Amino acid sequence: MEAIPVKQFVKHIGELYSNNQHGFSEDFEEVQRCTADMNITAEHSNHPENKHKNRYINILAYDHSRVKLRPLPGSKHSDYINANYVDGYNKAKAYIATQGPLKSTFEDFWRMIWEQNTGIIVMITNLVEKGRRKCDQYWPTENSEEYGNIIVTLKSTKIHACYTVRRFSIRNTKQNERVVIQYHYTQWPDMGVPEYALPVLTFVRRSSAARMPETGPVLVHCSAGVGRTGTYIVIDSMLQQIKDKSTVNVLGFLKHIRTQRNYLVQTEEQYIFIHDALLEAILGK
């Protein structure tokens, strides 16, 4: 199981799709088993102090990879946020994969962004989907909003067909200021799940190209911060790999980052979607 030449990969996809996606099912089942013989601790996520900081009780942040907040005077657990570094193709810790912030963790969320020198946010969910609460709004509708010692100012917005780009300037009262740009994918079906990959490919390319040398990791979140988040991470990384080596290793890369945050790429449908995105990128020449 190693890099497939980019020229065979598209044929590989035909094979994975055939006989009612039997191949895809094998692969993804292998993904879900890939940690069967691994005990990976998440003690901090489970500590009684940090429970209210987890959006879902079963979606945790592995200890070894968890992003740490600088501790606060005089609580012991003021260092916890449900978030993990994840590798990209290029560098280690190219991403912070995290849950959609809760109101109760908005300060942590922006503090992490400051401390980690993050300059790009990728949001892959709407606040509400199909009448359900997915994410609380951690940014100002207009002008400024204060979260702890970080003051966030919305500078501009461009609303595209399928996603929105908001440019913020944030300030640490401790002032020192930084630009943070948020790429927010907004197109989510009332019924069923996303199907066409091309708009997503474009969203990935543009949000990825926005990364600045040399800055902190890109923050990527959806609701739980695992399924759609992992899908973005694999598509982005594999495009890097294709550009660099003209090979692809979806199954191997995904098994790897699965050790860094639980459940990255959560469904077979997302797993298939990854391939469609990459197929679109390869066929588009």
Ligand SMILES: COc1ccc(S(=O)(=O)NC(=O)c2sccc2SCc2ccc(Cl)c(Cl)c2)cc1C(=O)O
């Ligand atoms: C149990 O977990 C889940 C179950 C279902 C869903 S779901 O909402 O029903 N199903 C999905 O999300 C699917 S299906 C094919 C594609 C997708 S998401 C496609 C997509 C869209 C925009 C971007 Cl930027 C990217 Cl990178 C990828 C999402 C999750 C999740 O946790 O992310």
